[PDB]
Paper text:
The N409A mutation eliminated the hydrogen bond with the reducing-end GlcNAc, but simultaneously, two water molecules fit into the corresponding position. One water molecule interacts with O3 of the reducing-end GlcNAc, whereas the other bridges the N-acetyl carbonyl group and Nη of Arg436. A hydrogen bond of Asn409 with O3 of the GlcNAc at site 2 is eliminated by the N409A mutation; however, two water molecules were introduced into the VhCBP–(GlcNAc)2 interface. This may be the cause of the decreased enthalpic term and increased entropic term listed in Table 3. Finally, the N409A mutation resulted in a small decrease in the binding affinity.
Residue numbers in the entry: 1 to 530
The structure:
């Protein structure tokens, strides 16, 4: 039988949790593989909808509602019928327990109402032509099971009944689990892989010893010096790194320390921090060349230059280029002056400070980026120190607002809104299920206003106008310190499977991570070799 070895997420121990709503604590093979989406939007190919459990959808002229047609004939793994009842339940379950809202769907969807057993109506809070894409982010679970659960917020869901390709838990240990074919998969005819095989891997250099040895099939991890280390080991060791999203230093505007708050909330300081960075050095050393300098103050990218008001970009490009002497003289003009003879600048109010910059434990490319930056900042007089907390701790720090500076990447969408909304909408700053991305706690009502209006109408210019509005607010306020535009790291082995997505066959985002819904479409193209 065919076993496909994947690695979507680092773990030190496998805890049996297949609750699709508990993304900070669950296993990362639950979404897509156990709970198939209504639609998969192909973000690499202009958000083209690929219909799965939903047949079709249509907005109204109002842009105030949308109806999804559920596909008939679909079965859960326990034989029960997949219906609009299940879709309508799940959107209620998120609606009444918003700690399960991980994308901010509650903000968009006023309520979920059902026409027939295969038609669901969504009533909107605001005009949004992109709301089918938001809707698809939400997990759909069997109401036939989840209804008499007393607390879905803490349900570990260890014995899952799903709609997706791999719902059977064949094996489970703390260091390995095997996830096998749903006996009743609606698309079973299209599926040629038997099982997902998921080994426990704690960090990048434990990973490195496995993948160089050919033990993996499908991965998306950072691999140091990949050409001499991984490529050279076998002719069947392959990779393809299509361009991905923004990576940036995020500063905490609500830091509880008087001294650090004084520095981090100062735009001259954020700018001097940014000019101290050598972006192109970080790319070549920390990532071995795998990226592109991002000198947009707005974080826009390079990939979305068509979207760019290049009058906004030019006015602040200097504050996002390597200029160590510029950094020093900006610190001096601002009044960040070393008054205690340590060589490190102090706040205007006279207090000494050091910036603690965090990146997740085991994310060695990020870890090296931060330590590089620590050195770069020391040269211009800013004292910082690198920290590498466990991802859960790194994550909690940001949601709670206890961190100083954090290095993070963002997801890369079909347009600039996936980055800008996730990184800057202040609505996404409260809520226990919220991701870390907007957690700098900078708030600007007018920024949120443009963001939510990005899809209020259907003409290209007005949208593009609204983009230039957003780019302008962000860049002049230097809210974050953008560094580079990264790569969708992706490695695949043709030893045991064929049909892989690659540069010759670029069917979509190729990664195995949770939050890349195209990974369902990807596994459906895979079949064994001999
Ligand atoms: C947008 C986002 O937050 N993506 C996360 C990924 O970065 C992350 O993958 C990890 O990325 C690190 C930084 O480049 C790598 O060093 C690390 O090897 C890699 N880990 C894996 C398992 O691929 C994944 C998984 O942690 O989470 C994404 O949400
Ligand atoms: Ca197929
Ligand atoms: Mg000093």
């Amino acid at each position: 039988r065919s076993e496909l070895t994947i690695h979507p997420k680092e773990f030190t121990t496998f805890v049996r949790n297949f609750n699709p709503f508990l993304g900070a604590t669950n296993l990362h093979t639950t979404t897509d593989f156990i709970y198939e989406p209504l639609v998969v939007f192909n973000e690499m190919h202009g958000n083209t909808p690929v219909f799965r459990l939903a047949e079709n959808f249509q907005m109204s002229d109002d842009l105030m509602s949308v109806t999804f047609d559920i596909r008939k004939g679909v079965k859960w793994s326990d034989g029960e019928a997949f219906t609009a009842d299940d879709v309508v339940y799940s959107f209620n379950l998120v609606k009444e327990k918003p700690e399960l809202d991980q994308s901010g769907i509650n903000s968009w969807v006023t309520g979920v109402e059902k026409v027939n057993d295969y038609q669901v109506k969504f009533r909107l809070s605001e005009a949004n032509s992109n709301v089918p894409y938001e809707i698809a982010k939400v997990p759909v679970v069997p109401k036939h099971v989840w209804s008499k659960v007393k607390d879905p917020s803490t349900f570990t869901n260890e014995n899952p009944v799903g709609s997706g390709p791999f719902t059977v838990i064949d094996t489970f240990t703390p260091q390995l689990y095997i996830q096998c074919e749903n006996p009743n998969y609606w698309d079973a005819a299209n599926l040629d892989v038997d099982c997902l095989r998921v080994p426990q891997i704690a960090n990048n250099d434990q990973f490195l010893g496995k993948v160089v040895n050919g033990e993996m099939d499908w991965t998306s991890s950072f691999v140091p010096d990949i050409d001499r280390t991984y490529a050279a080991a076998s002719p069947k060791h392959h990779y393809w790194y299509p361009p991905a999203g923004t990576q940036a230093f995020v500063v905490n505007f609500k830091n509880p320390d008087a001294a650090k708050n004084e520095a981090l909330t100062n735009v001259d300081f954020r700018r001097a921090f940014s000019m101290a960075l050598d972006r192109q050095t970080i790319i070549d050393i920390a990532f071995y060349g795998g990226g592109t300098v991002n000198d947009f103050a707005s974080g826009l990218g390079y990939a979305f230059e068509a979207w760019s008001d290049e009058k906004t970009h030019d006015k602040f490009k200097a504050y996002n280029s390597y200029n160590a002497e510029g950094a020093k003289k900006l610190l001096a003009k601002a009044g960040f002056k070393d008054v205690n003879k340590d060589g490190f600048v102090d706040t205007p109010s006279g207090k000494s400070f050091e910036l603690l910059i965090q990146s997740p434990n085991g994310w060695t490319d990020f870890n090296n980026t931060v330590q590089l930056a620590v050195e770069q900042l020391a040269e211009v007089g800013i004292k910082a120190r690198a920290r590498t907390p466990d991802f859960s701790v790194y994550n909690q720090a940001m949601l709670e607002g206890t961190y100083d500076v954090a290095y993070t990447a963002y997801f890369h969408g079909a347009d600039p809104y996936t980055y800008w909304n996730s990184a800057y909408n202040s609505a996404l700053q409260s809520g226990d299920g919220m991701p870390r991305f907007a957690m700098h706690f900078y708030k600007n009502e007018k920024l949120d206003g443009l963001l939510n209006s990005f899809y209020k109408t259907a003409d290209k210019q007005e949208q593009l106008e609204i983009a230039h509005g957003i780019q302008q607010i962000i860049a002049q306020d230097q809210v974050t310190i953008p560094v580079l535009s990264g790569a969708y790291m992706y490695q695949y082995n043709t030893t045991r499977f064929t049909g892989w997505w690659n540069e010759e066959n670029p069917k979509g985002r190729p990664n195995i991570w949770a939050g890349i819904p195209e990974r369902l479409l990807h596994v459906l193209d895979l079949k064994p070799v001999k």
